[PDB]
Amino acid sequence: EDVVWRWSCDNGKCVKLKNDPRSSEPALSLEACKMFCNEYGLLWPRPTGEADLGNFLSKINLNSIEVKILKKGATDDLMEAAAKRFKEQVSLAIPRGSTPKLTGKAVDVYLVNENPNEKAFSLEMDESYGLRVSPSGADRVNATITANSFFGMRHGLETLSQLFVFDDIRDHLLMVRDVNISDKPVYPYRGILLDTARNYYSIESIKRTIEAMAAVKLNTNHWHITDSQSFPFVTTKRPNLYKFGALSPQKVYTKAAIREVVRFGLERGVRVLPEFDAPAHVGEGWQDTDLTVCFKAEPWKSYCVAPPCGQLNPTKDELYQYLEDIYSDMAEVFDTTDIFHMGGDEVSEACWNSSDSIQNFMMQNRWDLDKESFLKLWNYFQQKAQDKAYKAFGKKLPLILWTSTLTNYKHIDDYLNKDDYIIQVWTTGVDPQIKGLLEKGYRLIMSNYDALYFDCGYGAWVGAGNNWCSPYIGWQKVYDNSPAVIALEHRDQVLGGEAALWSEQSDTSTLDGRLWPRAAALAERLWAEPATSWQDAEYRMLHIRERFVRMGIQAESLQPEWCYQNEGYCYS
Ligand SMILES: CC(=O)N[C@@H]1[C@@H](O)[C@H](O[C@@H]2O[C@H](CO)[C@@H](O[C@@H]3O[C@H](CO)[C@@H](O[C@@H]4O[C@H](CO)[C@@H](O)[C@H](O)[C@H]4[N+](C)(C)C)[C@H](O)[C@H]3NC(C)=O)[C@H](O)[C@H]2NC(C)=O)[C@@H](CO)O[C@H]1O
């Protein structure tokens, strides 16, 4: 049949009413009402600058959308790719199975890239843009996007595509008539950590993830590509690592596959940031190299915090030749990244202390078998690993490490320095380590586990009950979690945040639901740092969820669709 209802805006809420035949008032479709009833309409994330949507919509012909690139340059193929993708994205306003009438105005999109040669990812990159929409002559629409760089330009394309609504009452494709928007992200680093080691993720699912990221302007895919459970990274120089380390020969990331993902990311403003986690979290792949200790050590509880146990042996020099080669193979294929993540998850002192080679080596350096000495061994490892990373990437570049006993702000400056090392924070936001680190000059990526661990909440994967960081974290908690509140006056030292999906209990099948649409909550927090809380973003969050589903993403359902159709009636 055809849609029976209509919606009217009353005190910021779209309320459902019978579409009565005896009325001289034009009925509004659901999302047409939402576009002007909501403070920010259907936009996600909301702009940080001018956000003026005017009062009207204009009927648009889907086949009359043309894109013109005004300043040609070295980003030509990227801009042409993003332009070609524009039509497909506008089509996302239209629900599947619904066909818009081909009538209405023509749409001219004018892309102005002020520095058309700039293709590099950096923390200082300019992601700002400006968007104006306006009637041009009679039969057409002028959409002008102006940005300092390609990245701002394609963010602008994303926002513009969000200014289309499908009227399912009339079968009309509509677009906001008069728009003035200026926008720039609050934080340079907006990411998702994907663990592809604890379980395998098809590369299509990784690309699909990147798509969903670009839709909400997340700019960083942190690819945690190895751990103790597997080595899917294809290293041409050390091929036995992946041959013995992969879950199967099918479950692997080839050079061609990684290049595809990296390029796919670049086109969508997503930096693909590789991690090689060391000296802990190593395991499969290293068999018979004699370069590890404690692999599969039983009882595991006595050695590491989760099975299988395994750690690199810093005392073997051949190790750094392995490391150099791995980093080199990574540097070749992940060639858009300006940053390298070197892990540094808690090293087990028990693990290192159960080896003869290691104790002998520490005897000779006069170091003892106490704590500070194993901290010295770790530092020795990190200094050498770091040198090899610098060589592999052909330059010094920023390195990321997790908070750990090594990164304790009290002694951190013995080991690292704040110019070369960025610290990813997985503690709580109320943890004293954060203020210590900030006071000592260090930069942070907030992945605090009480608000940002997307794996929390499910059944236990060892024993019974629930998993370690339960309860499950709803989008509300991830929205209200503010790095500005956490870092206070030192907030410029916060580079941004990252949603972490650890994969002990997640893979190809579960990934859409794990990330979406909670990552969108993080996306807006990082993009706009709103002083407003989640309830103010609720309605738009429900819409963005629907947009994800339309994109083919299997996003988690937040609320009954009834709530979405009847704003204000679901509350607590
Ligand atoms: C086994 C047992 O009976 N333990 C009880 C507990 O009541 C309690 O100790 C708990 O033991 C668990 C297993 O040793 C600990 O779980 C582990 O926690 C770490 C984080 O500290 C997890 O690793 C991190 O998190 C992600 C996954 O979210 C993981 O993928 C990353 O590699 C890692 N890093 C982010 C740090 C890089 C780890 O996966 C998890 N392991 C599990 C669940 O097997 C748990 O932390 C610990 N709980 C507490 C509250 O300390 C202990 C309390 O006295 O008593 C033990 O008898």
Author numbering: 23 to 594
Reproduce text from the manuscript describing this model:
Insect OfHex1 from the Asian corn borer (Ostrinia furnacalis) is a β-N-acetyl-D-hexosaminidase specialized for chitin degradation during molting and metamorphosis. OfHex1 shows high activity toward β-1,4-linked chitooligosaccharides but is not able to hydrolyse β-1,2-linked GlcNAc from N-glycans, thus exhibiting very high substrate specificity. According to the CAZy database, β-N-acetyl-D-hexosaminidase belongs to family 20, and uses a substrate-assisted double displacement mechanism by which the 2-acetamido group in the substrate GlcNAc, instead of the acidic residue in a β-glucosidase, acts as the nucleophile. OfHex1 also contains a -1 subsite and +1 subsite for sugar moiety binding, and the three corresponding amino acid residues found in BGlu1 for binding the +1 GlcNAc are found in OfHex1(Val327, Glu328 and Trp490).
Since we have obtained the structure of OfHex1 V327G mutant previously, in this study, the crystallization of E328A in complex with TMG-chitotriomycin was performed and the complex structure was resolved to 2.5 Å. According to the alignment, the mutation of Glu328 to Ala resulted in obvious conformation changes. The catalytic residues, Glu368 and Asp367 are rotated about 180° and 90° compared to those in the OfHex1-TMG-chitotriomycin complex but with similar conformations as those in the apo-structure of OfHex1. The rotation of Glu368 led to the collapse of the two important hydrogen bond networks (Asp249-His303-Glu368 and Glu328-H2O (I)-Glu368). In addition, the mutation of Glu328 to Ala increased the volume of the active pocket from 646.8 Å3 to 758.3 Å3 as measured with CASTp, suggesting an important role of Glu328 in constructing the active pocket. The conformation of TMG-chitotriomycin, in particular the GlcNAcII moiety, was found to be very different from that observed in the wild-type. The most obvious change is the absence of short polar interaction between Glu328 and the C3-OH of GlcNAcI of TMG-chitotriomycin. Interestingly, a water molecule was found to occupy the position of the side chain of Glu328. The interaction between the nitrogen atom of the 2-acetamido group (GlcNAcII) and the oxygen atom of the carbonyl group (main chain of Trp490) is missing, but instead, C6-OH of GlcNAcII forms a hydrogen bond with the main chain of Val327. Site-directed mutagenesis indicated the change of Glu328 to Ala impaired OfHex1’s affinity toward the substrate, (GlcNAc), by 8-fold and the inhibitory activity of TMG-chitotriomycin by 42-fold.
